[PDB]
Design an enzyme around this catalytic site. Structure first.
Site, mmCIF file in Angstrom:
data_model
loop_
_atom_site.group_PDB
_atom_site.id
_atom_site.type_symbol
_atom_site.label_atom_id
_atom_site.label_comp_id
_atom_site.label_asym_id
_atom_site.label_seq_id
_atom_site.Cartn_x
_atom_site.Cartn_y
_atom_site.Cartn_z
ATOM 1 N N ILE A 1 14.830 2.246 34.435
ATOM 2 C CA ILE A 1 15.931 2.153 33.487
ATOM 3 C C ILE A 1 15.712 0.980 32.534
ATOM 4 O O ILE A 1 14.853 0.113 32.741
ATOM 5 C CB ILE A 1 17.276 2.034 34.221
ATOM 6 C CG1 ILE A 1 17.240 0.897 35.242
ATOM 7 C CG2 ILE A 1 17.609 3.342 34.912
ATOM 8 C CD1 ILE A 1 18.587 0.576 35.843
ATOM 9 N N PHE B 1 20.301 -6.767 40.715
ATOM 10 C CA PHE B 1 19.022 -6.616 41.391
ATOM 11 C C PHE B 1 18.438 -7.985 41.681
ATOM 12 O O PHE B 1 18.499 -8.882 40.839
ATOM 13 C CB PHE B 1 18.036 -5.814 40.539
ATOM 14 C CG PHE B 1 18.381 -4.365 40.419
ATOM 15 C CD1 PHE B 1 18.025 -3.472 41.409
ATOM 16 C CD2 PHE B 1 19.065 -3.896 39.317
ATOM 17 C CE1 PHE B 1 18.345 -2.141 41.300
ATOM 18 C CE2 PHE B 1 19.386 -2.566 39.204
ATOM 19 C CZ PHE B 1 19.026 -1.687 40.196
ATOM 20 N N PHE C 1 22.614 -0.762 47.752
ATOM 21 C CA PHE C 1 22.331 0.657 47.602
ATOM 22 C C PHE C 1 20.849 0.991 47.595
ATOM 23 O O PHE C 1 20.504 2.164 47.766
ATOM 24 C CB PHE C 1 22.967 1.200 46.311
ATOM 25 C CG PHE C 1 22.289 0.743 45.052
ATOM 26 C CD1 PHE C 1 21.210 1.435 44.535
ATOM 27 C CD2 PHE C 1 22.738 -0.376 44.377
ATOM 28 C CE1 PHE C 1 20.591 1.016 43.381
ATOM 29 C CE2 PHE C 1 22.120 -0.795 43.221
ATOM 30 C CZ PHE C 1 21.048 -0.099 42.723
ATOM 31 N N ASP C 2 19.969 0.012 47.410
ATOM 32 C CA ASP C 2 18.537 0.267 47.409
ATOM 33 C C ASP C 2 17.803 -1.037 47.658
ATOM 34 O O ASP C 2 18.245 -2.105 47.231
ATOM 35 C CB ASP C 2 18.077 0.886 46.087
ATOM 36 C CG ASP C 2 16.651 1.382 46.144
ATOM 37 O OD1 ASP C 2 16.041 1.314 47.229
ATOM 38 O OD2 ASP C 2 16.138 1.840 45.104
ATOM 39 N N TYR D 1 22.366 3.609 34.748
ATOM 40 C CA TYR D 1 22.612 5.042 34.826
ATOM 41 C C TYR D 1 23.853 5.485 34.058
ATOM 42 O O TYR D 1 24.131 6.686 34.004
ATOM 43 C CB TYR D 1 22.722 5.461 36.291
ATOM 44 C CG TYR D 1 21.438 5.235 37.051
ATOM 45 C CD1 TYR D 1 20.284 5.927 36.717
ATOM 46 C CD2 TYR D 1 21.371 4.312 38.079
ATOM 47 C CE1 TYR D 1 19.108 5.719 37.398
ATOM 48 C CE2 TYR D 1 20.198 4.098 38.766
ATOM 49 C CZ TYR D 1 19.070 4.803 38.421
ATOM 50 O OH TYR D 1 17.895 4.592 39.103
ATOM 51 N N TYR E 1 12.362 -5.534 45.228
ATOM 52 C CA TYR E 1 13.708 -5.628 44.695
ATOM 53 C C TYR E 1 14.722 -5.233 45.755
ATOM 54 O O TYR E 1 14.397 -4.613 46.770
ATOM 55 C CB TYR E 1 13.873 -4.748 43.454
ATOM 56 C CG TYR E 1 13.843 -3.267 43.744
ATOM 57 C CD1 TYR E 1 12.644 -2.576 43.792
ATOM 58 C CD2 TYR E 1 15.012 -2.560 43.963
ATOM 59 C CE1 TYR E 1 12.610 -1.228 44.054
ATOM 60 C CE2 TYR E 1 14.988 -1.209 44.226
ATOM 61 C CZ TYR E 1 13.784 -0.548 44.270
ATOM 62 O OH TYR E 1 13.751 0.800 44.533
#
Ligand SMILES: Nc1ncnc2c1ncn2[C@@H]1O[C@H](COP(=O)(O)OP(=O)(O)OP(=O)(O)O)[C@@H](O)[C@H]1O
Lengths: 48, 806, 144, 107
Positions: free
Chosen positions: D56, D99, D36-37, D82, D26
């Protein structure tokens, strides 16, 4: 938004055939053009 | 990126056939994936250039261009009326795949540096013959008017039959039947009239170009001999061409040049006539479709056709000269090309600043693959990118096109090089001298000195530098591989010069003068422009005022100036669905922000554009106007049309002060300032403008998350030009409230130090990557098309400036 | 040519007659190259031919040329310099000493013909002697 | 919430079932478009078991809506992410996440 951001990115390059077409009043160039691209191989993720 | 619906959507994968259609009339660009339509179109985009097919990619792909004909067989039928792209190859060109605006290339013994590519323009296909209607033939020319009408046609038939073209009832090039090889007077009426007109037109053009003509012989002029063409040159119908026979004449070089100009004019007239009739260019001839391989302006025509036309016109000139008419070539009118800005044109490659040398004896080589405008030498670390090498005191270079040495100006020195010549540049900082050798032989000035420059102040040091003009190719050898140097041992080794990069573990990094305009802060020492940060008084908001330092004086620089503010305003992620004192609730709940520009009296409003730009604006257009702004509409609908969305995309949202200048005030200089206010609603995407309080009719709509920079484009007409006023209006927040988070609820106008005026600069230094993608382009076959392959990955660490989206 | 230059540097009458000849006959020295000791063909011809000589000396010899220059500065004779070099051969600069000598040696050995040079001690002392003498006298002349 | 938009097709038959371990790659971006990731930067597939509430809600549902070998884009709202708290230092409060997930395999 304040601190400069860093990240690893892929280099990208462009390729063209030497074919140029345009439009202008009184020009000698045809107005409608067509071409195709066939995709033989693609690695979806060769890098991150 | 806008998602576009299509059957079986999927990111391009193997065995996918994309079909691209360009219709320049609308204009529109449409796609078709595996024959299925792609429910989306680009349209209403700028047409001030030439379009070419393109594929962009990263490493890890294999693709093939299918261009039709013998250059790739289409998998799907082109939509009715669209021409295969292989028909667009110019007469003097060969179809092949290219990189785009490359500054670097591979070569037999290393990388080649490449100067700017000289490219055509969409206006280069518009034939432009010189007006020849008002040129009425003076008596003698009128007398000879129709005389060439027969002779040229006779020569034409004779040339056809000499090359093997034998009369026939119809047009059949295979069996060679041709209908027009019949007596000129009885030649089909249209062609006969055309030939009469052209026979006169040669004389008319002679006069129009400025040639001086006058009778010189009468009896010798009458004396005429024809050609006794034998049965081989006689026609199938029996007609015998009877061209005029005369070989007792010679040609001056000016006359040959005039012949070339006449051929150009004639071909351009023919091309214009065929374009008016409705013909177009095509690599493959198609008479029924009015496509002709020669229908291009003479300049782009093939060499053979040029020679044929020149031969015909030369024969005509010989006929006139033999008749004695004193055809004095027109007084040549001096002119230049000045196609571009010389200061910003040549691409400069220099070694990185960290490599500057402040002592020792250093040597490097520069092979000139071409023979044009290339400069090579030693530059100071603070070399500017927008100034020609050696035009200032920051570079000592050698220009071997004409053999000059450049430093603070030009001076004859050395001799011009030829293709393949290697210039060895040497710097001796113990003696403070610079030496240039050509093919191992030291170059001497006209006086006779071996050194090119003397008494060189060391300063911060020196760096290898070269500058390549448009179309030029060089090879810079800094000597890392001492054996690679070709003329080092002959000159420099014994003198004690050391290759510049001899003991370097890795190749020397280079920087090149990228010609992509970029917004940079206005220099605090700029010779012509001054920006004053005026504080906000009781009845005036904070302001940034521009003044032209050197207005109304010699050396003054008057040209387009593109200014923006350093910080943007960003529209909200999601848009809302569907006294003179501020009201606290309204002012604290509003999302509309305002800023004005005061164009000072004296500064013509017709020379000022006010509004916003996005981070993508990169146009240093010296003849700017709102018609030059980039724009394109992306329209998406259903299968059976039913447009679902139509978004307009641009990078400049501005208004013109000419829209507000009033006709009564037009034609005279006004004595009142013009205050243009700009309002943006960050929650609805709506941008509006006002002029002197009154609202204007212009309005723009942008998409969420859009970043807009306050901007002003102006052509200075007064010492006081414009003033960014960062004020507010009743119930409307100032710009600072949108720009700065801490001020999101502060209605007091502010101009913090970060907010400053930046101007567009045409050229900037940019680092050359040390490694480049290895792209393999070849021709797979006559049916497979042209294959592009790139398999080796290549990455870099990018540093992102968040506010500039760069 | 180096021997002739050495004679020119040593004898002062030779320089005087050179200056006379050039001044009286108004010979264009710059024309010959393409009044001034710089244009004096006696030293200019040397300067032109000097790389030919220096190409003989292996870069290892550079130290020995330096030492021979010191001897000539101390005003020794040719035999004195020859014997000084003969008994100071071991002072031969070692290539490993400096990286510059590394690539200089690379070029010198790579070029054909020089692979067999820098072998025989008497040849080495000779070449260093001649080149050092020429260099010393050239330095003396170029000193104004 | 969660919206799934296919990028590359999968087999279309083998779908995740409760208790199975989904192995994916991902790349997480904020709605604005800031990365961010990304597991591909760590060069190690991310494994998570369905039904254990390890990831999540947006993941728990979107990945379940995918098929083995399928590459998809998951657009997840704050409630399915979140939420108001966010991820201090990484994800701002009340942030929509995008994502680019690829269901490598099931185990
Ligand atoms: N490609 C061209 N370049 C320049 N001039 C041209 C060209 N084609 C035609 N012309 C002009 O038109 C004339 C055409 O020749 P002519 O009228 O004798 O024969 P045609 O049979 O009518 O023409 P075509 O052979 O083109 O069908 C040429 O002599 C020249 O004047």
């Amino acid at each position: 938004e304040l601190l400069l951001q860093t990240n690893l990115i892929n280099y990208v390059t462009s390729i063209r055939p030497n074919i140029f077409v345009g439009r202008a009043e009184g020009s000698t160039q045809y107005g409608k053009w067509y071409f195709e691209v066939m995709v033989d191989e693609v690695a979806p993720f060769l890098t991150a | 990126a806008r998602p576009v619906t299509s059957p079986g959507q999927h990111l391009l994968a193997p065995e996918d056939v994309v079909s691209c259609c360009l219709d320049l009339s609308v204009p529109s660009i449409s796609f078709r994936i595996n024959g299925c339509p792609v429910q989306g179109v680009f349209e209403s985009f700028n047409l001030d250039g030439l379009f070419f097919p393109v594929v962009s990619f990263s490493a890890g792909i294999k693709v093939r261009f299918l261009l039709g004909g013998r250059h790739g067989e289409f998998k799907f039928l082109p939509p009715p009326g669209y021409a295969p792209c292989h028909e667009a190859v110019l007469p003097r060109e060969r179809l092949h795949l290219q990189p785009i605006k490359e500054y670097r290339r591979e070569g037999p013994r290393g990388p080649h540096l490449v100067g700017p590519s000289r490219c055509l323009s969409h206006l280069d296909f518009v034939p432009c013959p010189v007006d020849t209607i008002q040129i009425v033939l003076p008596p003698h020319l009128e007398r000879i008017r129709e005389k060439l009408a027969e002779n040229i046609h006779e020569l034409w038939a004779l040339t056809r039959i000499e090359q093997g073209w034998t009369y026939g009832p119809v047009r059949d090039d295979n069996k060679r039947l041709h209908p027009c090889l019949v007596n000129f007077h009885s030649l089909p009426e249209p062609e006969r009239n055309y030939n009469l007109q052209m026979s006169g037109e040669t004389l008319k053009t002679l006069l129009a170009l400025g040639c001086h003509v006058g009778m010189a012989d009468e009896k010798a002029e009458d004396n005429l001999k024809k050609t006794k063409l034998p049965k081989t040159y006689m026609m199938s119908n029996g007609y015998k061409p009877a061209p005029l026979d005369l070989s007792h004449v010679r040609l001056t070089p000016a006359q040959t040049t005039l012949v070339d100009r006449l051929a150009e004019n004639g071909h351009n007239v023919w091309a214009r006539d065929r374009v008016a009739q409705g013909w177009s260019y095509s690599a493959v001839q198609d008479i029924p479709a009015r496509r002709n391989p020669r229908l291009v302006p003479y300049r782009l025509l093939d060499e053979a056709t040029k020679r044929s036309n020149r031969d015909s016109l030369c024969q005509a000139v010989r006929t006139l000269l033999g008749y004695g008419y004193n055809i004095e070539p027109p007084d040549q009118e001096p002119s230049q090309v000045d196609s571009q800005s010389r200061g910003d044109r040549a691409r400069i490659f220099r070694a990185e600043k960290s490599y500057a040398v402040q002592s020792g004896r250093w040597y490097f080589e520069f092979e000139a693959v071409t023979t044009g405008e290339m400069r090579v030498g030693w530059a100071r670390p603070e070399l500017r990118p927008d100034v020609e090498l050696g035009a200032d005191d920051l570079a000592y270079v050698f220009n071997g096109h004409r053999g000059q040495r450049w430093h603070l100006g030009s001076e004859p020195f050395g001799r011009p090089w030829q293709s393949g010549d290697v210039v060895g540049c040497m710097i001796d900082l113990t003696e403070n001298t610079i030496i240039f050798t050509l093919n191992g032989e030291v170059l001497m000035s006209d006086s006779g000195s071996e050194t090119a420059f003397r008494d060189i102040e060391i300063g911060d040091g020196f760096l290898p530098v070269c500058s390549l003009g448009p179309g030029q190719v060089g090879h810079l050898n800094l000597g890392q591989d001492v054996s690679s140097l070709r003329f080092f041992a002959i000159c420099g080794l014994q003198e004690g010069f050391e290759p510049f990069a001899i003991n370097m573990q890795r190749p020397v990094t280079t920087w090149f003068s990228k010609s992509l305009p970029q917004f940079e802060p206005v220099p605090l020492e700029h010779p012509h422009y001054e920006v004053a940060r005026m504080d906000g008084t009781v009845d005036t908001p904070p302001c940034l005022r521009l003044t032209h330092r050197t207005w109304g004086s010699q050396n003054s620089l008057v040209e387009m100036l593109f200014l923006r503010l350093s910080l943007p305003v960003q529209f909200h992620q999601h848009f809302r669905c569907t006294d003179n004192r501020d009201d606290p609730e309204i002012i604290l709940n509003t999302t509309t922000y305002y800023y004005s520009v005061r164009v000072f009296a004296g500064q013509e409003p017709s020379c000022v554009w006010v509004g916003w730009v996005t981070p993508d604006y990169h146009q240093h257009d010296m003849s700017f106007d709102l018609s030059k702004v980039r724009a394109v509409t992306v329209t998406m609908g259903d299968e059976q049309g039913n447009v679902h969305s139509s978004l307009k995309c641009s990078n400049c949202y501005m208004v013109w002060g000419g829209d507000f200048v009033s006709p009564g005030q037009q034609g005279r200089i006004s004595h009142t300032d013009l205050v243009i206010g700009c309002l943006v609603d960050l929650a609805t995407g709506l941008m509006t403008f006002t002029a002197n309080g009154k609202e204007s009719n212009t309005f723009f709509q942008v998409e969420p998350n859009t970043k807009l920079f306050p901007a002003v484009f102006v052509l200075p007409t007064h010492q006081n030009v414009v003033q960014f006023e960062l004020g507010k209006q009743k119930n409307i927040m100032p710009l600072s409230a949108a720009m700065f988070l801490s001020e999101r609820k502060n209605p007091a106008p502010q101009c913090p130090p970060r907010l400053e005026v930046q101007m567009l600069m045409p050229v900037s230094w940019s680092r050359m990557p040390n490694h480049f993608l290895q792209v393999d382009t070849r021709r797979a076959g006559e049916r497979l098309g042209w294959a592009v392959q790139c398999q080796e990955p290549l990455m870099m660490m990018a540093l992102h400036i968040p506010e500039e989206n760069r | 040519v180096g021997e002739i230059f050495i004679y020119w540097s040593k004898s002062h009458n030779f320089k005087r007659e050179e200056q006379n000849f050039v001044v009286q006959n108004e010979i264009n020295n710059m024309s010959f190259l393409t009044y001034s000791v710089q244009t004096s063909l006696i030293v200019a011809t040397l300067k032109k031919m000097l790389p030919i000589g220096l190409n003989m000396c292996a870069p290892t010899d550079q130290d020995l040329i330096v030492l021979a220059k010191a001897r000539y500065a101390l005003k020794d004779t040719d035999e004195e310099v020859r014997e000084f070099l003969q008994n100071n051969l071991n002072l031969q600069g070692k290539v490993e000493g400096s990286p510059s000598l590394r690539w200089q040696m690379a070029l010198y050995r790579g070029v054909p013909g020089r692979e067999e040079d820098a072998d025989d001690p008497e040849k080495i002392v000779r070449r260093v002697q001649e080149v050092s003498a020429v260099l010393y006298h050239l330095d003396q002349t170029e000193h104004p | 919430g969660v919206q799934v938009e296919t990028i590359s097709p999968g087999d279309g038959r083998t779908f995740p079932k409760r208790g199975q371990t989904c192995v994916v790659h991902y790349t997480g971006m904020l709605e604005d478009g800031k990365k961010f990731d990304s597991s591909r930067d760590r060069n190690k597939p991310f494994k998570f078991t369905l039904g254990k509430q390890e990831v999540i809600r947006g993941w728990e549902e979107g990945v379940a809506q995918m098929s083995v070998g399928q590459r998809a884009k998951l657009i997840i709202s704050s409630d399915y992410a979140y939420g108001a708290t966010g991820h201090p230092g990484i994800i701002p409060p009340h942030a929509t996440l995008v994502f680019d997930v690829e269901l490598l395999k099931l185990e």
